[PDB]
Design a protein around this ligand. Structure first.
Ligand code: ADP
Ligand code: ADP
Ligand code: ADP
Ligand code: ADP
Ligand code: ADP
Ligand code: ADP
Ligand code: ADP
Ligand code: ADP
Ligand code: ADP
Ligand code: ADP
Ligand code: ADP
Ligand code: ADP
Lengths: 73, 173, 173, 173, 173, 173, 173, 173, 73, 73, 73, 73, 73, 73
């Protein structure tokens, strides 16, 4: 109920971890950003924190889209 | 020679393991009996940064529910009739290395909690009193039951789920 | 951005928190699981005078009832087989800051008492002997059970109730 | 305004308190929970010669049975893992004043003895060794259980009974 | 005089025993009631390197399933109402010698596991907590039921089978 | 005056009792209801070396088959919902004296075994765990059924028969 | 006003009650339905020394024969699927007072025995294990059937008859 | 008036005391609780040559086993956190007079030894280091337990037995 | 089959109880002693133990005869 | 059973705390004073001590009435 | 078993304390002396020591009788 | 199936017990030795162990024959 | 499903144990090697580990063939 | 196992103490000497040292026999 938070938060996280695991990950793609906004996030902020540490590690290029995310969300 | 991974979904799961390499967040492995869970933990750890470090695997079913909260962590002297020394811990033995808790669902609510506290704080105390030990152990839970379900049954702490649910691998039969 | 409070009863409870600001009397928070209790403690403390000071939150359920009275307070050496040093305390770690005891009802009669003694005197001793430490910790109890009831069941010390019942906040589901 | 005593049996008990004024022999108070025991101790002491002197009331239940014999008296350094200084005592803090031990029946046989020794000699030692301190504290025991009974159960030292049983007040529900 | 072995299949089994001499891997003996199983264990041990060492034979049926996991291993104080001392163990009594578990099939899933853990690690803990004892005991299981079957019935842990199934002797009726 | 024995076969049986005097091997008494079995046990013990020692007679039928293995031996705390203290035992109460188990055939296979173990080792454990008590009790079994038969019915352990069948007295109707 | 007794045979029976006053030996009351048995028990107890003490009357027919041996005495935890606490007892509730077992003939052979054991020893154990409780309860059996008969039918233990047959009152229709 | 001795065995024991007069060898008194042990010590000393000298009676149970070896003898500074002065001793206070150790069996093996050394040498040191004090104290041990037994239990040093067993008086209940 | 026991035993009992319930009961009368000897005593020593505790309590004077006994035997 | 104490005590307390937390709170209104007198005060003096520290903090103006009190009592 | 001691001892004590707490108490009355002799004195000399320190303090006039004593004995 | 064992074993036992219960029992008579050899010994060595502890205790003189044995075997 | 592993592994094991129990066992014979390859090895690597420790101990000469193996496999 | 020592030793001791406590005790009587030789002396020389210091003190006349000794041995 704060879809206006998912994309900013997520982006926070993607930054934390991208720096924590030294990964050249800059950010999410549109396709991905959508998904993140549609997911119900039962865990809420917590679950997104995990979903993205996980997506940062699984990340291969500079961005994240339906690819790594769908694996979870 | 080598080990065995060749099916797509596993051709995959191996990599997921490889990527997770440089990490330490707990990992939750789930698949039917025999699918290779405990084989993945072992591989995750062979691949983590702490491969050379110990691997403390302990079946949570291989110990009466009333003595798990006495052997996982440790024990502060004279709190239970007969104590030769405050009891060390698999957590302490696994300090610096991996702690593969097999069959998680079989954790008492009391320890499910007590683990959570150590997954976040990393500090623990043997029985009543306070923490006086420093343990750096990467949690690796594997269970063959469906965690989520157990959460609606109240047999499994949810917050402990998401905590171990950082990285989640599911081995298909 | 920000946090979330907008319903009347909560539009309220926030303020009650704000007023309580300049205080230190313990606070008793009660609401069903998930209602935001531990979110209020945290906010009360972000607002108290000691916000910059530590926040020592400890789930009273996340520790076997026999080791709580060993970790909350502390432990005087050689009193329980195996003691590497007289054990410090969450009370001592929370000294100068807040000590959010979650799920109070889960306190043993022995500690329920031992807490009371520290809510009034503020001094405590690790096991048998006497107090030799000075702790300034604001108590913040939160429980999801109905305290009063527990009092007629004898599972909860009454005088400890009124002591924590200085300020009482009730979070509606 | 004032306090409350008006029923015959209490109209009485007040006086008994008043007479006892000029005394120091221990006193044994007994009545169901809530009857006013701890209210009488407090009054006895407000009336004793040492009213202006301290009142060291300590619930014998508000401390784990293994740390009472560490806080009532005191503690000689390095005898239990971790000792910041030989521990003072409620006996020492109550020196010159009253020491109201509430809920006596809850005294370990070990301390029941150790108290007796201090009710007669008035000297005590912190742990192993010998007495090196001088304490002048008037004992005031209050319990809600029936002492005598406990004596046939062996849970309560008899000689310690008669010693505290110098003056005995019984508060009727 | 002597003992009795003269039929081919037994003329054999004796030797198998003799060869196994210099070993310590557990042994699984199986034959109908009366066939001489427990007579072979005893002989295996008379022949092992540790003949002079003790022989701790215990019928797994001669103890209520709820107290086996209390007497085989041992018991950590105050974990079950009434404990005169943390309970020793047949494992500990059999330390350095043989531990002939008769009628294995009659092992609870909980102990079947708990044994496995001690057949591999050799370390065990009495109830909740951690291992603090060192036992060197050669396992000798004998059962009259068909193990394999029990494995498809789920009444018998498979991995515990292969672990004891290092050396397997079958006594023909 | 005196007691009553005058028929040849009994003029006899008395003596057999007298001879057995200096012994402690268990004794198996058998005769139809009322024949004087329990009168002989009592006499055997009046004559044994431990006459002045206690006589713990217990009807094995006077206790629900599910609580015999809880009262004969004893009970280790918290193993069955509700335990005020690890339960003592008729074996422990009969320690140093005689334990006359009446109506043996009525022993559960589980206890029939558990007794055997205590007739040979003399050591026993209350539930799961290990033996921590020393009992010196002379077994005296009396039953009105035909033991042997029961052995082919599988309702009665044979090895337990021969163990109690050291000395066997048969009272003719 | 008063109660009703005026016929010779009852003018009598009242007195018999009065004399029995100073006693505690069990009493066996017998008369057709409605004759006043349970009215006499009640009067016997109003007259016994323990009138002010409780009266625990329980219809032996008002409970399924399989749960009587679970509620009369008590129950040791986990012995029957589902146990919230070792079950107390009407014997324990009747401790210090009278226990009026109505319709005795309806006692299972198993309890008929189990009662006998408690009429003589006065000690009892909840299920398997041993006695750990002290009960002082005066037995008062009342039945409308003819006991003696039942004895030749084998439905009623004889020795239990004579034990309750200390004092016997027979109410004429 | 006087004291009380008139039964033969005591008419005796008094004299034994009288004879022992001119002596100083330790004395071992034994009888059930209340029999008059501590009354005899006191009389022995009223009769010894050192009657006018002090009587230092100390209940060995009236002091936690860990502080006895700190108060009986004495204490050398800074050896246990917190020491206001090297602690004197009941031995030193009893110097020149009697030292009645009540309930001897309750002596730790460590002190049982440490006493022996002072019963023979008469010199002692407070903690680690060497003897620098001269004490002339007549030992008078009284216990209600059976010493000999304790010797086979290893709870009581034998050589310390015979040392105190110079003169032995046994008070009959 | 020990009628030589009934009267002595009985007398034992009458003593036990007369002292147990503080009753001024000294002993049985002839008339009573007879009865006790004729009764078959199926319960034997046990039944007599009860029959007399019961007769001691029911006792009114100093002795016991056909009176209280017949109530039972 | 000392309704003659509630209003004086309360007034004691309201003073203690008003000074302890530097609050411009002078005292209770009639409407409030009533309530305080009707409440059963199971905790008695203790409970009133708390009820008012709490009411002093919750206080907004110079007085206290049904408002803050009802929150509790 | 030394009733010949109770009255002398008691009298000792009554003197000790009467002097210890400066109380004008001279001694026990007959009525009182009786009681003291009938009490079983389980504590014996000790219990009497206490019973009387206590009775000396509770004393109001110059003597002690059933009054203060009954309070205890 | 080891009749060559019965007589030696038996003799072992008779020695153990004769010494265990301080009985002047030296050994079995021919008549007895026969019986022991004919008995089927279902219990085998065990049963003979018992049969003889029992026969040692029941023994009256220096030897054992059909007498005590028949009681059992 | 790794028959290319059985013979190498087996050979590993046969070495471990041959050295662990000081047995002059060099290796398996053809006849034996076949069997090992045909067995289904449900236990897999584990079962082979045991099957051979066992075969190393049972070994009599320098080699292992159908002989010791058949005992198991 | 040195019964040839008991009587000489004992006699040593009886001398030491007889002189230590100024007691006119010359020595043991036959009856006594026997006992001393039969006692097992678990404590050995030590126990005899005590047994006799004790017997010297308990001594009344010039000699010691079954009398004082039996008290112990
Ligand atoms: N609003 C937020 N912005 C950025 N991160 C957040 C926010 N809320 C929570 N988190 C992160 O998510 C996790 C959830 O934390 P927490 O505050 O404990 O949740 P809860 O509401 O259950 O108390 C934290 O570890 C934190 O780092
Ligand atoms: N992917 C795999 N490749 C080779 N061997 C495997 C693989 N997965 C499982 N195994 C084997 O199967 C067995 C079962 O292993 P395990 O993973 O521990 O079971 P579970 O998954 O129930 O914990 C192991 O002994 C291992 O050698
Ligand atoms: N009022 C709120 N506004 C925003 N988030 C909230 C609010 N209340 C609860 N939450 C969220 O819900 C979760 C549950 O929190 P918590 O208060 O700790 O549970 P409980 O009340 O049982 O202790 C937290 O992670 C938090 O982020
Ligand atoms: N006689 C009395 N007069 C006035 N207040 C009393 C009286 N007795 C008890 N109280 C009150 O009741 C409460 C219970 O007090 P307390 O005596 O400490 O309980 P307990 O007797 O169990 O120790 C106190 O807070 C006190 O104010
Ligand atoms: N091969 C044998 N030679 C001689 N005696 C034997 C032999 N086998 C068994 N027995 C005897 O048979 C009895 C049955 O023994 P046991 O092996 O313990 O039974 P189980 O095989 O069921 O455990 C033993 O008392 C033993 O003396
Ligand atoms: N030989 C006997 N001489 C005298 N009384 C006997 C004799 N045998 C049995 N009795 C009596 O018979 C009753 C039945 O006794 P008991 O031996 O206990 O029965 P059971 O043989 O079935 O156990 C006893 O109360 C006892 O007094
Ligand atoms: N002698 C009596 N005098 C007055 N009322 C009686 C008398 N006897 C029985 N009653 C009444 O009759 C009813 C039947 O009582 P009860 O004795 O309980 O039946 P039963 O004898 O079958 O147990 C009771 O409610 C009681 O009030
Ligand atoms: N022989 C006696 N004569 C007179 N009083 C005695 C005698 N023996 C004991 N007592 C009394 O009994 C009480 C119990 O004394 P005590 O000897 O100290 O107990 P214990 O023998 O257990 O140490 C004392 O207070 C004392 O006055
Ligand atoms: N010979 C006797 N002399 C005196 N009292 C006896 C005698 N025999 C039995 N009794 C009494 O009668 C009751 C019957 O006892 P018991 O010996 O158990 O009988 P049973 O022969 O059935 O075993 C006992 O409680 C006892 O007090
Ligand atoms: N009569 C009073 N007047 C003013 N304040 C009081 C009064 N009685 C109690 N209080 C206050 O209420 C609290 C209750 O105190 P307390 O005396 O311990 O109660 P209790 O009767 O239970 O012992 C105290 O902290 C005190 O400050
Ligand atoms: N060959 C033997 N020689 C002497 N005594 C024996 C012999 N065999 C058995 N015994 C005795 O008989 C009993 C039978 O013992 P056991 O070996 O346990 O039999 P099983 O064959 O059933 O295992 C033992 O207690 C032992 O003392
Ligand atoms: N690939 C292998 N090469 C050599 N030995 C092995 C191999 N795999 C397993 N083993 C041996 O077989 C046993 C099976 O081990 P494990 O790895 O635990 O199996 P799982 O797959 O079930 O986890 C081990 O003790 C090990 O020594």
């Amino acid at each position: 109920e704060r879809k206006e938070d998912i994309i900013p938060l997520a982006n926070h996280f993607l930054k934390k971890f991208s720096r924590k695991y030294a990964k050249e990950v800059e950010g999410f793609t549109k396709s991905a950003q959508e998904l993140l906004l549609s997911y119900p996030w039962y865990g809420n902020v917590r679950e997104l924190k995990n979903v993205i540490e996980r997506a940062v590690l699984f990340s291969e290029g500079k961005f994240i889209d339906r690819g790594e995310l769908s694996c979870l969300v | 020679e080598e080990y065995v991974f060749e099916s797509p979904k596993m051709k995959e799961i191996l990599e997921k393991i490889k990527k997770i390499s440089c990490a330490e967040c707990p990992v939750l492995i789930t698949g039917e009996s025999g699918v290779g869970k405990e084989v993945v933990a072992r591989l995750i750890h062979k691949l983590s940064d702490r491969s050379k470090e110990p691997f403390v695997a302990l079946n949570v079913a291989s110990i009466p529910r009333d003595i798990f909260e006495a052997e996982l962590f440790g024990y502060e002297k004279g709190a239970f009739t007969g104590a030769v020394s405050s009891k060390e811990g698999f957590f302490e033995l696994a300090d610096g290395g991996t702690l593969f808790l097999d069959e998680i669902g079989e954790l008492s609510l009391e320890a499910q909690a007590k683990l959570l506290r150590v997954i976040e704080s990393g500090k623990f105390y043997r029985l009543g009193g306070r923490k006086e030990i420093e343990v750096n152990v990467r949690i690796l839970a594997a269970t063959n039951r469906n965690i989520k379900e157990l959460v609606k049954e109240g047999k499994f702490r949810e917050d402990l789920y998401y905590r171990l649910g950082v990285i989640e691998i599911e081995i298909p039969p």
